C-alpha cells in the first residue's frame, strides 16, 4: 500500500496533462483560419475523442489504485508544470507549430513516466505506453502536415 501512492501520483499529473491537452486541442480547433483549416479539424477531432478517453483510462486506474482522480481546472493547473496555450485565432501554419511543441512536452513526460514505473506498477506502465504510441504518432501527423 506504499508504492501504490507514488504510482497514483504520476498518473494524476498525466490526467491533468491529458485534460490540459484535450482542452487545448479543442482551443486550437476553434481558433484556426487561413489555408485548409478543415484538414486540421479532421486531424484534431479524432485526437480530442482519443486524448479525452486517455484521461478516462488514466482516471479509472487511479480510482482502482485506491485514490480519487482530480479532474477539475484548479487541479489541472496545480499539476501543470508548463504554461498556458498562447496562440489566439491565427493560422494552421502557426497552430500546428504551436501543437508541435505542446506534444514535445506531452511525449517527453509520458516517456519520463513510463520510464519511472517499471519497478512500480507495470499494468500502469503498459497503459501509459499504448498511449505514448498514439501520442507520438499524432505529433508526427502534425509534423508531416507542416513540411
Give the residue ranges of the annotated binding site for Fe cation.
Answer: 29, 56, 60
Contact track, a copy of itself, 73-92, x by CB under 8 A: xxxxx--x--xxxx-xxxxx
Asked if residue 132 binds a copy of itself (CB under 8 A), the reply is: yes
Asked if residue 38 binds a copy of itself (CB under 8 A), the reply is: yes
Closest to a copy of itself by CB, 5 or 133? 133
CB of 59 to a copy of itself, least distance (A): 4
Asked if residue 1 binds a copy of itself (CB under 8 A), the reply is: no
Secondary structure (H, E, C), 10-42: HHHHHHHHHHHHHHHHHHHHHCEECCCHHHHHH
Asked if residue 53 binds a copy of itself (CB under 8 A), the reply is: no
Report DSSP state, residue 86.
Answer: -
Long-range contacts of 49-54 (CB under 8 A, 24+ apart): 50/134, 51/18, 51/21, 51/22, 51/25, 52/18, 52/22, 54/18, 54/22, 54/131
* Chosen residue from 60, 101, 104, 112 binding a copy of itself by CB under 8 A: 60
Amino acid at each position: 500500500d506504499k508504492k501504490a501512492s507514488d504510482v497514483a501520483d504520476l498518473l494524476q499529473k498525466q490526467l491533468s496533462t491529458y485534460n490540459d491537452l484535450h482542452l487545448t486541442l479543442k482551443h486550437v480547433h476553434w481558433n484556426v483560419v487561413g489555408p485548409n483549416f478543415i484538414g486540421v479539424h479532421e486531424m484534431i477531432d479524432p485526437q480530442v475523442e482519443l486524448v479525452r478517453g486517455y484521461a478516462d483510462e488514466v482516471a479509472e486506474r487511479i480510482a482502482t489504485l485506491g485514490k480519487s482522480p482530480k479532474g477539475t481546472p484548479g487541479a489541472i493547473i496545480k499539476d501543470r508544470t508548463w504554461d498556458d496555450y498562447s496562440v489566439e485565432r491565427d493560422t494552421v501554419q502557426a497552430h500546428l507549430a504551436a501543437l508541435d511543441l505542446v506534444y514535445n512536452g506531452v511525449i517527453e513526460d509520458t516517456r519520463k513516466s513510463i520510464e519511472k514505473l517499471e519497478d512500480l506498477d507495470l499494468v500502469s506502465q503498459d497503459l501509459l505506453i499504448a498511449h505514448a504510441g498514439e501520442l507520438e504518432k499524432f505529433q508526427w501527423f502534425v509534423r508531416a502536415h507542416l513540411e
